From a paper:
Proton-coupled oligopeptide transporters belong to the major facilitator superfamily (MFS) of membrane transporters. PepT1 is a member of the POT family of proton-dependent oligopeptide transporters (TC 2.A.17), which itself belongs to the much larger major facilitator superfamily (MFS) of secondary active transport proteins (Reddy et al., 2012). Peptide transporters are proton-coupled symporters and use the inwardly directed proton electrochemical gradient to drive peptide uptake into the cell. Using modeling, molecular dynamics, crystallography, functional assays, and site-directed spin labeling combined with double electron-electron resonance (DEER) spectroscopy, we present a detailed study of the transport dynamics of two bacterial oligopeptide transporters, PepTSo and PepTSt.
The existing inward-occluded structure of PepTSo (Newstead et al., 2011) was found to be not suitable for constructing a repeat-swapped model due to asymmetries between the N- and C-terminal halves of the protein, which led to steric hindrance problems during model building. First, a lateral helix between H6 and HA is resolved for the first time. Second, the residues that make up the cytoplasmic thin gate adopt different positions, such that this structure is inward open (the new PepTSo structure thus resembles the previously reported inward-open PepTSt structure). Third, some weak difference density (Fo − Fc) is present in a position equivalent to that observed in the previous structure, indicating that this crystal structure may not represent a fully inward-open, ligand-free state. Fourth, a solvent-accessible cavity is observed in the new structure that permits protons to access the ExxERF motif on H1. The resulting pore profiles confirm that the central cavity in the new structure of PepTSo is accessible to the cytoplasm but inaccessible to the periplasm, hence the structure can be described as inward open. Although these two residues are not interacting with one another in the inward-facing structure of PepTSo, again only comparatively small motions would be required to bring this about. Examining the structure of PepTSo suggests that the kink in H8 is due to two prolines, P345 and P353 (P329 and P345 in PepTSt), the latter being highly conserved across the POT family.
Author numbering: 8 to 512
């Protein structure tokens, strides 16, 4: 077997793109606090910074749906990646050019979310269909390299970019990733004559959505349709969220609508799924049933993303008020996660998991996902006490946030490295694209909670609850989020026992 000569041009493109993304995302929260949002009072500024960051993340893990659609329906993967990558480049440029204008900076974030998210499903799979049956032995080695560039990039970008921002300002700190991103596209363009382009996939008339549409619109004799009522309810509810945009916010409102719609339509279709058998194959309707069960699984995982994504926003804010060295910047703590990932992932699989299995435990992939959410919630118990403990008294940053990072990352390996691969085995191969699409929306919805948390916290009724606790609002939210994960981890274990009673033995 020989290495396809196109692979180096994709690994190289990925390397630069992953460096440029983590490069500007990891100094995004510091930049908002020190520079762009200075017109906001300090106490107020922390809440506005989180909104900007997490509204950005939301778009990053929402726009894969647009990207995958454009590639499959019209222009193909190569051409879609190329033009989304150029837009991605422009977005990075906007961040430098409109350094001092808020409207212009938000616009650049949008283009980055559009470019980075749009090419996220396309690039990895595009790399995949460059291997034939003879090559396939090497494909696993190629995707291994992908994994390395993610961590390599996220590690060094967390170290170098805070320093670059400190010494040179935003224009240089945001321009260097932009330069890097342009080189990323050049590498991808340099192998255009080499790439293998798979023929456009034929649309499935028995796909996930056509079955859903059948389950709602098909009328059975002498009965009503509860399912379609729920759909209309979600349509009504979404409208109630869309109208309340002035309170919620634009990105928060659009997600609330999206969640309510897909939430109520999904519920309604489940009630009436047997009606779909009239218009669709038995194997195809059964598959949708398999996916709908995975949906509930993913929904309970969303509080994990709420805690894991806040390390680049909330956790940085806390590190600002801790005891750090002269050379050290609070944003450099983010480098701990890729380091811990590359340590725990070989540790667990080789040393720890067989050691827990030696005790006798099964260690089902479903058992690990539930444990990971709890440990992630546990990590925020530690983050919460620290805030309490440092409300009066001073604790150093560099030693102390190593513990929450150790627990957070350990929960990430249990959940994030297990979820999608497990769901693939649970549903028919045809649903692989549908499963992947809801997995990325899982991250989006998780960050929606972060958005809705500090929206509800500004309401009069909630403040008095905070007043009664006699706790700092900052610390109160953390414990809320800690309990948010523990509760979901409980319900997860409750649903997981019913889940394994279903499809097979
Ligand atoms: C599900 C559909 C929603 C997708 C929206 C895509 C968003 C991508 C980038 C947005 C960046 C701009 C963020 C600014 C913002 O919302 O600020 C929040 C507010 O609290 C302060 O102005
Ligand atoms: C400012 C310029 C930055 C340029 C450097 C960025 C990254 C450059 C190269 C990244 C790594 C390329 C390795 C490719 C490779 O050998 O893949 C394996 C092949 O399949 C086997 O030979
Ligand atoms: C039909 C596109 C509508 C989508 C609306 C929102 C997205 C905004 C910009 C998407 C950019 C599309 C990139 C792909 C592309 O332009 O391919 C062009 C072909 O290569 C032309 O031969
Ligand atoms: C009180 C709910 C708070 C909001 C949570 C997020 C969204 C909620 C539900 C969306 C995803 C679940 C819908 C799919 C579904 O009903 O599957 C059911 C299966 O048929 C199980 O038998
Ligand atoms: C949650 C299941 C029912 C959703 C009905 C459609 C609602 C309209 C917009 C909500 C956003 C989610 C779109 C669904 C989706 O991810 O489709 C996946 C495709 O099958 C992927 O190839």
């Amino acid at each position: 077997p020989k290495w396809p000569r196109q692979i180096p041009y994709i690994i190289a493109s990925e390397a630069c793109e992953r460096f440029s993304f983590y490069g500007m995302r990891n100094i995004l929260t510091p930049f908002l606090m020190t520079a762009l949002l200075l017109s906001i009072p300090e106490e107020l500024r922390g809440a506005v910074a989180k909104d900007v960051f997490h509204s950005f993340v939301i778009g990053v893990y929402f726009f894969p749906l647009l990207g995958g659609w454009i590639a499959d329906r019209f222009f193909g993967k190569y051409n879609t990646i190329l033009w989304l990558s150029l837009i991605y480049c422009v977005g990075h440029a906007f961040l430098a050019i409109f350094e001092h204008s808020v409207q212009g900076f938000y616009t650049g974030l949008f283009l980055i979310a559009l470019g980075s998210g749009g090419i996220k499903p396309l690039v990895s799979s595009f790399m995949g269909d460059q291997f034939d049956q003879s090559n396939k032995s090497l494909a696993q080695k190629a995707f291994d390299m992908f994994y390395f560039t993610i961590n390599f990039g996220s590690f060094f970008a967390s170290l170098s970019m805070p320093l670059l921002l400190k010494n040179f300002g935003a224009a240089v700190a945001f321009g260097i990733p932009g330069v890097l991103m342009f080189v990323a596209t050049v590498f991808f363009w340099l192998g255009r004559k080499r790439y293998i382009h798979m023929p456009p996939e034929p649309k499935d008339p028995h796909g996930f959505l056509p079955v859903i549409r059948s389950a709602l619109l098909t009328k059975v004799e002498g009965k009503g349709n509860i399912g379609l009522v729920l759909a209309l309810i979600g349509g009504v509810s979404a409208a109630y969220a869309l109208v309340n945009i002035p309170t919620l916010g634009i990105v928060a409102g659009l997600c609330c609508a999206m969640v309510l719609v897909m939430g109520f339509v999904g519920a309604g279709a489940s009630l009436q799924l047997e009606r779909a058998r009239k218009s669709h194959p038995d194997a195809a309707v059964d598959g949708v049933r398999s996916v709908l069960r995975i949906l509930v699984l993913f929904a309970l995982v969303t509080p994990f993303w709420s805690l894991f994504d806040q390390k680049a926003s909330t956790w940085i804010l806390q590190a600002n008020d801790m005891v750090k060295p002269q050379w050290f910047e609070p944003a450099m703590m983010q480098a701990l996660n890729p380091l811990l990932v590359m340590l725990l992932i070989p540790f667990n699989n080789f040393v720890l998991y067989p050691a827990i299995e030696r005790m006798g435990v099964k260690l089902t992939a479903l058992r690990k996902m539930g444990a990971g959410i709890a440990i992630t919630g546990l990590s925020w118990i530690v983050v919460g006490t620290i805030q309490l403990m440092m409300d009066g008294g001073s604790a150093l940053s560099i030693f102390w946030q190593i513990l929450p990072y150790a627990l957070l990352t350990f929960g990430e390996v249990l959940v994030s490295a297990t979820g999608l691969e497990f769901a693939y085995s649970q549903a028919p191969k045809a649903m692989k694209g549908t499963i992947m699409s809801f997995w990325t929306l899982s991250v989006t919805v998780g960050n929606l909670w972060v958005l809705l948390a500090n929206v509800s916290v500004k309401s009069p009724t909630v403040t008095e609850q905070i007043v009664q606790t006699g706790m700092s609002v900052t610390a109160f939210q953390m414990f809320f989020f800690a309990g948010f994960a523990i509760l979901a981890a409980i319900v997860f274990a409750l649903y997981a026992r019913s889940y394994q009673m279903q499809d097979h033995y």
